[PDB]
Symmetry: C3
Subunit: 263 residues, 3 copies
């Protein structure tokens, strides 16, 4: 149902069954499907399409010409009732596309909270975007991509299907990411290669000097020691016995399927 304190523009079309929370705002020429849930305080500026089985949280701002929940572009998708989940306080700018999952991929495309999704950013079927991320203009996630917390993806950058963008990563603009990017790393180029630890981001987010140093040492194990990833895995787990921030590497290794970006 539509909360009595929500606003639906007379020109918007909210189909029966849609759930609109208190003090939400559905602007002019919006289309909201019958399986959509829009949380308290969320704003659809105008000309927004939201359909499918789509759950949107609180205090989001979705700008004109965005397409949220829409049928995905996977070649095998056949209309199965998959899902989209979007959290809270996200800013979803003009022409962003966020597509529903595929049965084969797990049925869910998920976006966290406090993200900035810039003009024409694309979140393909079965992607998982975390919290406090930034996807710049025209940043494109192919199917099944994970972008972990605080990760930043520069403008005009594409992420190859199934890849993982680790937490606190920064991918420079105009890059093509064809493999997995470990947490805390700067990547850039096409194909993208690693350019060290995102020190400035770790600074600004309150990482201690000891944590940044341990992370930098974990970086050197992976990329400078010359040892294989299998040799360095216990060495990094060892270092994480003292510096818990280094565990992000261990958890990341367990999920990686396409290998790490390398130079």
């Amino acid at each position: 149902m539509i909360d009595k304190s929500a606003f639906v523009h007379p020109t918007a079309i909210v189909e029966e069954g849609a759930s609109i929370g208190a003090n939400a705002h559905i602007g002019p020429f919006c289309i909201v499907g019958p399986h959509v849930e829009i949380g308290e305080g969320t704003v659809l500026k105008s000309h927004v399409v939201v359909n499918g089985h789509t759950k949107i949280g609180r205090d989001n701002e979705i700008y004109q010409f965005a397409s949220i929940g829409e049928v995905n572009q996977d070649l095998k998708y056949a209309g199965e009732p998959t899902r989209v989940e979007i959290g809270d306080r996200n800013r979803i700018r003009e022409s962003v596309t966020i597509h529903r999952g595929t049965v084969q991929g797990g049925g869910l495309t998920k976006v966290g909270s406090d993200n900035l999704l810039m003009i024409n950013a694309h979140i393909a079927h079965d992607c998982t975007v975390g919290n406090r991320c930034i996807l710049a203009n025209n940043a494109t996630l192919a199917g099944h991509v994970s972008v972990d917390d605080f990760a930043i993806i520069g403008g005009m950058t594409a992420v190859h299907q199934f890849c993982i963008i680790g937490a606190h990563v920064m991918v420079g603009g105009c890059s093509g990411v064809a493999q997995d990017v470990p947490p805390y790393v700067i990547a850039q180029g096409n194909h993208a290669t690693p350019f060290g630890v995102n020190i400035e981001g770790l600074k600004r987010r309150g990482f201690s000097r000891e944590a940044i140093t341990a992370i930098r040492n974990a970086y050197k194990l992976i990329y400078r020691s010359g040892k294989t990833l299998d040799e360095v895995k216990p060495e990094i787990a060892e270092l994480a016995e003292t510096y818990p921030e280094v565990k992000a590497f261990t958890d990341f290794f367990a999920r990686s399927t396409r290998g790490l970006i390398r130079h």
Copy 2:
């Protein structure tokens, strides 16, 4: 006229003279010009602009914020009544742009059937897209570009004006194609260079082992023999005397104007 079995949303604006076929669906806030023809069963989801002298076939799906038939971006275009032709069973996703031709270019932008045109794909004036193609997100065809049957263009890839993308080609994402790509070839990079025969695609599309081998040999003639294209042209026509699939090269050579992509 509008067929009695077609649906036009009360908020859509279909101008007098438009031709809407049986069981077509013009969704909310669509704009359909007086010279537009939309074939049986085609769906305009919502917020779709279709204008100019534009013929659209059967069972197409055109998603919100697409612009079909619109004035092209050629610097000399001056409003002449050029045309767009689109065939059947195409999926034209959010924000795709397909622009009318130019007098100088021949007056026609043409798209075949069974194509998937992903988010923000661009088909410039005077382009010819064949059947069963895929243009991924942000794939951009400049003016006068040909994309032949089954060709696939990866996301964020641009094709330079007048270039030809041969049949069964695969262009990797994040690539810039500045010259013609022969049939059956994989291209990638920026500028794009050839990376062999698209064997997997030829497999999946029912090419025989003999056909793939002859094609691979035609590839080696062009790119490994060291002979000039003029020397290899009769050698490829010779090989096509036995393997008709190799004729695609001959027909492609007759159309190529910008030279082949080379390494």
Copy 3:
């Protein structure tokens, strides 16, 4: 107020306080904010959002799904009443985004006259675009970017924040510009590097043979002499004592903050 000779489509929403000039045309499903000024003869085709403190001049054409004046994407912006200025006779194609300034950046995003802004071109907060420019499909200006008169930016090209694109520059498509581009120069690649003087453009725009030669000599001073920019600055000012066209370099040097693109 809305001029008696202006046309506002019954489905458009022009908020009280908007200023619409004579023989302007606000098409279907457009949204025009109360602080917007639209000059004589300007056309909003359909599905156009224009808001904020936005001044738009005469004889512009703004195509469907464009977002003009909208809140910028700068991470510190907090809703301050910044501004957009757009001049005359601009063609602003589908899905173009032009965002308002930031207090910190000077409060103004400005676009000149006689520009062609192609599909999905982006003009970030605090940018200055001059006169007679071309931004091709998906050309993206980050914040605080200047694009000087007659400059052309190829499709899928991004300009890094704070950079200057000099007058009569040509940036090839699929390029990433991370530093300032001097007037009259061709740039291309990623990162973009200089490829000589834009001779053909200077030809077509009426530059004399003497002017092109002096410009070419100024190019060689910067990029071939091997001298530092500080050594060449008085040499270029010297050459400009005879060839006033060379002064564009001097004025450009005074504004450059990110260094010149180099090979």
